[PDB]
Amino acid sequence: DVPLTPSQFAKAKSENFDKKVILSNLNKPHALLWGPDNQIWLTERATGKILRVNPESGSVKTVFQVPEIVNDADGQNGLLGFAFHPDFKNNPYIYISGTFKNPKSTDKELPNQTIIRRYTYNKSTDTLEKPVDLLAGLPSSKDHQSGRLVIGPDQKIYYTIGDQGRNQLAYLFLPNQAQHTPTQQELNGKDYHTYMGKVLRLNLDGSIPKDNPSFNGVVSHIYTLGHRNPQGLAFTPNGKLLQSEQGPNSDDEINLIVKGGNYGWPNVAGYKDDSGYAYANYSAAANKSIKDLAQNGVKVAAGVPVTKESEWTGKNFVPPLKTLYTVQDTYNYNDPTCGEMTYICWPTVAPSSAYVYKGGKKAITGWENTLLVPSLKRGVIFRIKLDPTYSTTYDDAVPMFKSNNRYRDVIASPDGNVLYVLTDTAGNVQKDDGSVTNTLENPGSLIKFTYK
Amino acid sequence: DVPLTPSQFAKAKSENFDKKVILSNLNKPHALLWGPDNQIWLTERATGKILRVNPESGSVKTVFQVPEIVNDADGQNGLLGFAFHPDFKNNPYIYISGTFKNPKSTDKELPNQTIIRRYTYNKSTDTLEKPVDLLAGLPSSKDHQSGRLVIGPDQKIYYTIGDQGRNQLAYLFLPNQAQHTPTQQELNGKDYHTYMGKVLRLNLDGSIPKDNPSFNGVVSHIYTLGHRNPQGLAFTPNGKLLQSEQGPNSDDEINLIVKGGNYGWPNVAGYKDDSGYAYANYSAAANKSIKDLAQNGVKVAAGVPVTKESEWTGKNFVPPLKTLYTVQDTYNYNDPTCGEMTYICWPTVAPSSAYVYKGGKKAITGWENTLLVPSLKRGVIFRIKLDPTYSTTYDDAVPMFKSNNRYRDVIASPDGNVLYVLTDTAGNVQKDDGSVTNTLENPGSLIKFTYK
Ligand SMILES: O=C(O)c1cc(C(=O)O)c(-c2[nH]c(C(=O)O)cc2C(=O)O)c(C(=O)O)n1
Ligand SMILES: O=C(O)c1cc(C(=O)O)c(-c2[nH]c(C(=O)O)cc2C(=O)O)c(C(=O)O)n1
Ligand SMILES: [Ca+2]
Ligand SMILES: [Ca+2]
Ligand SMILES: [Ca+2]
Ligand SMILES: [Ca+2]
Ligand SMILES: [Ca+2]
Ligand SMILES: [Ca+2]
Ligand SMILES: [Li+]
Ligand SMILES: [Li+]
């Protein structure tokens, strides 16, 4: 899609909802879920706390704090995945992922791993216990961790794991592994370094499903590959798997996740269109003193090999359902009209989640078959319509709830007339006038929006 | 997708197949089908003949000649749709569409109508009889008739009817009706003027299915709207409906046809990307002497209103699964290489059909879940892989069978190792070196390609 302008974002104020801030100054609140007890459960990524919030009183209880979660103040690591077992009344399990020290690493510079872990909820003591590591030794870094964890209708865990930030910023010269897949020898050794930029599908005990797709002759936990930072993952009522993903300077994506698909990253951003992005592989640069011009690969410094999207030899490439947004090669990624933090005007929205709106007895008019996609950078939540079979999007991503907030997650109440949203505690967001602020209106908040 | 170069088309010679001409004396052969008698049935668009060819021996019989078919030598009209009833042994019906004079028209700029008609096949005399008009008074013109007629798994007729060529060439100043839908009064009066640029879904008697979608508050025969020239329509084994469509100077499309969808034409070519196309509505130019610069709306003469794709207020807009091809605004539609016909270098392929390859006992390796899309202008048949659920394309459209021929239709044998192709009698095609020829290697032929 074509970017919206600052004025188009500014007017999306959702006057048809009442806003009530339930809590603020949460410590990097990250995921929220409607609990089996009809309370709001949310995670604090930085502290590893799992909080249960009564939405009417805002009363909070720290149900559990995941011990030894590792979080860096300037990082996206910490407590990430969070899901309830779908049959919680008979299987009172919570599944998480998080960043933990990796004792198998003596290197003090990539010191952590990601672990997918199950806890058991004890209703008598109202806490979590009996941890079981389901899958350990997963990559970890400060960037592009993703970590959305959902349980599918097939009773498998689906887990997004980002590309770790390779090929940008602090990890510029590390080779991006989104396209790489494990050999059998690596699987035998539990060497999961290729589990970057993937959607994994795991049995509930963490084992590899025998019916997972094959990539390069090997079935692993990988379900799909070629992702950058896939923070959103949600099943539709008819069993399809929708996803949102953050692109680089362009081409955030809404994807339909299909078994064995290749979502193209880093070779392809968005559509395979050679439009506004090319793959500049800094790990293959002539030397490490080269600078990233940060022009999305369209213009690069000498010495970094660039591959057009159309030059990539890909297999099973799956294009996005929708890009937020796609631009042409003439696009100026250094456009100063937004101010001197030019990225704010980049044709992206930084989607942080993806939520399938299920309606209910108070369903919001017109919202059938919608996907809600919060935006960190634009301070909106997008509503994306699909057809009733969830086979295509209809029309464009409609912005809602414009504010100076980095929206991090969204759910709806069972009745469907109330949305609950998390916001980041700190960061930059685009103001109504298009410029950047790091003054967030509701830092680290749980907000409810009630349809009038 | 990004256009292939002439060199990339030239190399797609399919040396792994043996070519044999079965019939070489056909006049404007248009559709071909594998019939319920395991013979190949094909139509001749201008003569109205329906021929049956024995695939083993190549003997051919004219089964029927549809009387009073109207065809213009400079036109795409004539005998178009052609399908068998799916339970032919018990319901020996053939369904056609064709151009016939409209005695309710009293001028000869648009003197004809399209009629969807059923015939009963008489096996004892090997002919068609008992014509029944199922839907008459449909639009007709010389351009963009489409007319693919298939019977879906739901036992309904699906019929593509193009946009009649409005807003280009001889029909430049007629308002394109692809977005227009009938009022209840028009519909009740059998006024089908809005049945342009549509996929229709009809009951087998021509009536309106009670579960057809609604557009603008009216349930009509329209199933989808917003099409330009949808020449290909084919159901997949799991009941999805794939389509190919000719775009203007760009953005031929492979579409997934979803009930009630709006495929965007003429406001949107391909993706809603504002890239390489804009909608210049010549019918809205006050000055009817204005010239069409034929730069895809990106460059226009003074006096024609232009709407960007992103400026359209659309409902239920469904983007294509694949474009052949999309280019940026900097693209030069007058780039020399094709001579006085710079339009053969246009980033399109002119798809003429869409065929779901079903494999079989001798299925071609790697062709699982492919859609075969013949190209008129490039003299290739594209192979487009989809995932096993036919939810997305995988990778790119792979050209095959490069020759100086305008490929008009394709089917495969039941075992899957033979492809049968029709070629146009006349027209332009791109040569290996990228230039244009109107010397076709196999004018008006039925050809078979057998995997080696
Ligand atoms: O403008 C853009 O494209 C853009 C903007 C942001 C933004 O939010 O400011 C981000 C981002 N996402 C997270 C996150 O926690 O998900 C953190 C950051 C960050 O830059 O600090 C990204 C990206 O990571 O791709 N792209
Ligand atoms: O280069 C392009 O875009 C292009 C090329 C052709 C071509 O075949 O040469 C056509 C076309 N299609 C048919 C048909 O029978 O379907 C007839 C013609 C014609 O030009 O006479 C179209 C189009 O009608 O969009 N576009
Ligand atoms: Ca980004
Ligand atoms: Ca992608
Ligand atoms: Ca791209
Ligand atoms: Ca065309
Ligand atoms: Ca379209
Ligand atoms: Ca377009
Ligand atoms: Li590796
Ligand atoms: Li009308």
Numbering used by the authors:
A (entry chain B), B (entry chain A): 1 to 452
Q: Paper's wording?
A:
The active site of PQQ from the wild-type enzyme at pH 8. The density at 5 σ from a Polder Omit Map (PHENIX) is superimposed onto a model of cleaved PQQ. Residues close to the cofactor are labeled, and show little reorganization compared with the structures published by Oubrie et al. When compared with the structure in Figure 2, the cleavage of PQQ is clearly demonstrated and the pyrrole ring is seen to be almost perpendicular to the quinone. Electron density is observed directly above the cleaved quinone, which could possibly be attributed to a molecule of H2O2, although there is no direct evidence to substantiate this hypothesis. Consequently, this density has intentionally been left unmodeled in the refined structure. The crystals were subjected to a relatively modest dose of X-ray during data collection, estimated (from the measured beam flux, the exposure time and the crystal volume) as 2.75 MGy for the single and double mutant crystals and 0.9 MGy for the very high-resolution wild-type crystal.
The soluble glucose dehydrogenase (sGDH) from Acinetobacter calcoaceticus has been widely studied and is used, in biosensors, to detect the presence of glucose, taking advantage of its high turnover and insensitivity to molecular oxygen. However, this dimeric enzyme, composed of two identical 453 amino acid monomers (pI = 8.75), also presents drawbacks in terms of broad substrate specificity and loss of activity over time. Briefly, all crystal structures contained a tight dimer of sGDH in the asymmetric unit, the dimeric interface extending over 1110 Å2 being maintained by the presence of two calcium ions as described in Oubrie et al. interacting with the N262-D273 loop, referred to as the 4CD loop in the nomenclature of Oubrie et al.. 2Fobs-Fcalc electron density maps from the wild-type and both mutant structures all showed a different molecule instead of the PQQ-cofactor, corresponding to a PQQ modified cofactor, with the bond between C4 and C5 missing.
